[PDB]
Amino acid sequence: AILAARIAVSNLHKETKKVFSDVMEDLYNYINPHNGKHSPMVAKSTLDIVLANKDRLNSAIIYDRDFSYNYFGFKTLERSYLLKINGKVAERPQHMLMRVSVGIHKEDIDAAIETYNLLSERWFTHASPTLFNAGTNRPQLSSCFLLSMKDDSIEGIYDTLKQCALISKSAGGIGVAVSCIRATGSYIAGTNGNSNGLVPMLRVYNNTARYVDQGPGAFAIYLEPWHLDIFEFLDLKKNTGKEEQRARDLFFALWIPDLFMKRVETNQDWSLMCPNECPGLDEVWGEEFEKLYASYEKQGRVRKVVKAQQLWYAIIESQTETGTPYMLYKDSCNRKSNQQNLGTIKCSNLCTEIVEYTSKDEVAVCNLASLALNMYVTSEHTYDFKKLAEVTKVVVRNLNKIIDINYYPVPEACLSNKRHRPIGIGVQGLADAFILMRYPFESAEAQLLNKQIFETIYYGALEASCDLAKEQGPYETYEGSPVSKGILQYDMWNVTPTDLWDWKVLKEKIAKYGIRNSLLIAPMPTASTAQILGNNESIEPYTSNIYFQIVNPHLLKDLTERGLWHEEMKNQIIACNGSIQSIPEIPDDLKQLYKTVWEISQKTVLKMAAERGAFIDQSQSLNIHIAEPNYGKLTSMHFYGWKQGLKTGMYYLRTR
Numbered sequence: 001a002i003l004a005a006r007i008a009v010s011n012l013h014k015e016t017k018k019v020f021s022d023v024m025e026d027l028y029n030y031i032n033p034h035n036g037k038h039s040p041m042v043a044k045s046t047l048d049i050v051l052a053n054k055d056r057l058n059s060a061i062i063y064d065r066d067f068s069y070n071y072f073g074f075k076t077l078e079r080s081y082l083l084k085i086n087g088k089v090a091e092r093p094q095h096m097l098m099r100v101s102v103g104i105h106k107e108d109i110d111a112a113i114e115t116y117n118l119l120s121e122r123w124f125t126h127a128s129p130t131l132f133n134a135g136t137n138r139p140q141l142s143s144c145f146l147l148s149m150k151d152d153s154i155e156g157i158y159d160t161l162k163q164c165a166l167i168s169k170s171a172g173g174i175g176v177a178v179s180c181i182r183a184t185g186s187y188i189a190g191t192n193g194n195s196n197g198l199v200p201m202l203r204v205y206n207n208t209a210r211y212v213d214q215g216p217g218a219f220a221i222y223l224e225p226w227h228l229d230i231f232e233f234l235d236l237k238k239n240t241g242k243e244e245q246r247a248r249d250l251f252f253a254l255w256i257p258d259l260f261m262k263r264v265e266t267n268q269d270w271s272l273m274c275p276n277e278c279p280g281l282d283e284v285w286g287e288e289f290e291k292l293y294a295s296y297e298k299q300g301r302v303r304k305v306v307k308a309q310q311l312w313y314a315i316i317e318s319q320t321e322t323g324t325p326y327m328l329y330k331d332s333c334n335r336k337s338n339q340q341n342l343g344t345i346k347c348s349n350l351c352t353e354i355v356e357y358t359s360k361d362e363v364a365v366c367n368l369a370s371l372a373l374n375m376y377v378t379s380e381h382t383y384d385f386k387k388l389a390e391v392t393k394v395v396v397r398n399l400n401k402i403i404d405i406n407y408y409p410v411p412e413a414c415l416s417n418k419r420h421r422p423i424g425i426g427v428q429g430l431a432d433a434f435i436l437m438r439y440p441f442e443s444a445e446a447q448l449l450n451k452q453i454f455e456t457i458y459y460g461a462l463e464a465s466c467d468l469a470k471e472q473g474p475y476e477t478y479e480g481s482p483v484s485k486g487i488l489q490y491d492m493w494n495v496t497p498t499d500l501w502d503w504k505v506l507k508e509k510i511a512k513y514g515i516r517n518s519l520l521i522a523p524m525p526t527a528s529t530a531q532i533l534g535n536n537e538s539i540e541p542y543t544s545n546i547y548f549q550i551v552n553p554h555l556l557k558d559l560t561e562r563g564l565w566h567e568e569m570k571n572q573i574i575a576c577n578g579s580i581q582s583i584p585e586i587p588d589d590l591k592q593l594y595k596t597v598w599e600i601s602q603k604t605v606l607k608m609a610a611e612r613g614a615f616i617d618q619s620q621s622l623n624i625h626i627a628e629p630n631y632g633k634l635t636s637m638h639f640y641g642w643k644q645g646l647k648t649g650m651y652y653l654r655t656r
């Protein structure tokens, strides 16, 4: 595959123009061969700027950087990231990167080139939609969106459905909070009828997701477990059953109050409620939620009572069957959100890393990028935290520009992003960083470096956001927020950061100028970009020693350098489903370093998530890998994560 990749890049170079401004002119002049219609594939404002600075821009680009991409990463770029004219790729990766850089920075050519170099050297990456759409007409640069139901009426349900349609069309994933919609059997005063509840409503969402493609629609549906239709909700993804009791193309998440977990643990009863009868449960959290909920129980405003454990069993069994629902702890998400001055946060997003406020007037937006953590390790096996912080500042300014540039699919999204200016900086290559540092994932050394990486990210992000506020003013809803009061994320976990960074001085800078962004950090999945860049995904442990059979480059390098490589090892790894643990020739220090996600404790995975979690103001797309699951294991895992203070206790459950 190494030679294959070079030939394919060489072929693309052969088959494309060299000069960036030339390619930009061809893209802009494009004429539809069917229509004879002039449909520019790049925006005029962007072309104007490129032609006006063509010598600097053209001569900045380093075409040899195209050879950096591995075989499958490059094919993925050819497949979806490089603009085509009549089915033939016109952009080199370098062209697309500069198109992106100018797309974000406009007149600021200094800025564009700095971004172009970071991106082309692979220090970080913008999100797929940004890479698709930057520098094009009506550019939709943001990844995903959150929304609440407008109202518990046919009017509201269908207006919200139209929003999802429009957003899906513009290539956004969606998280939707549905708990305010009344349940099965509940009275409808305007028709003198009774509601059929959530399921048939969700079947309309399900078919709308099948209908409207991203640029299939990906809608995660969020429900709080007090809702009367909670048991049916839990069946919607299952492969068995009647079509009318199924919504199999949606994704499912629970927005879990502390009270539920406490009542499961102490084996108490659990009241199911109808939201028309028991209003506002979704608009309070913590103690205020607890009081309200118990008050409705004392008022008899309850439709059904079950054992908390019977609903617990249903949740776990659904996860055993489908890997879902996702597990979010509502009170952890609200109690530790810088956005908590806005009101109660009703849901997360499609990938469970975004925690942002949504109302009938506001659709929250996820503005995302990831840092390639592997790049910050020196030949010395030391971590360049200073460089990591420096790159993080660049990314904050870039995402901040994206908020003002973005073409919003609905006006509610524009209003939310404009008022709160949240961003989500994540990571990839965490497992690679540890491997490069020679630290096993579970080691104490990895554990300290995990904290310190995320301390650095948060610090650098805050610093750039603060400089932005000094330059532009704080975001609109800043005063009255926890950070305006001197409360940073780790304080809300009661965590004292290491001595690596000077938080006292940063807090003084923030007390004086404030900050530009209500939120900053959010480790997202990185499924596409990690494969483009050749890193392990996001914060995940090592997936496998093999992925054409491509042995992991780091392992291959280490075994080659020791004299221990033999081409036979390939098939032994395959026979061991990606493991190197039972290969006798490989030394123990290497076996430890290259343990797979299936050989790594999930308890330590959750702990390490909680640990970094103190420095992540949003949440984290945290998958859980349990080869051989059972109810005790899942129970233990969820309760452990809940009690660690995790916002997102579980994204996907994976097994084998």
Ligand SMILES: C[C@H](c1cccc2ccccc12)[C@H](NS(=O)(=O)c1ccc(Br)cc1)c1n[nH]c(=O)o1
Residues within 6 Å of the ligand: 598, 599, 600, 601, 602, 603, 604, 606, 625, 626, 627, 628, 632, 633, 634, 636, 637, 638, 640
């Ligand atoms: C489910 C269980 C668990 C996951 C999280 C928190 C826990 C908290 C308390 C008790 C169990 C918990 C998990 N079981 S597991 O998936 O079979 C497994 C065990 C060891 C290794 Br190595 C890899 C996978 C586990 N990880 N570590 C540990 O001790 O258990």
Ligand SMILES: Cc1cn([C@H]2C[C@H](O)[C@@H](COP(=O)(O)OP(=O)(O)OP(=O)(O)O)O2)c(=O)[nH]c1=O
Residues within 6 Å of the ligand: 152, 153, 154, 155, 181, 182, 187, 188, 189, 190, 191, 194, 195, 196, 197
């Ligand atoms: C009319 C109708 C409503 N519903 C649901 C949609 C909402 O969740 C809920 C109320 O719909 P609404 O459209 O609010 O009905 P309404 O205003 O006539 O009556 P009320 O004053 O009681 O609101 O009932 C159905 O599930 N099926 C139906 O055929």
Ligand SMILES: [Mg+2]
Residues within 6 Å of the ligand: 152, 153, 190
């Ligand atoms: Mg009504």
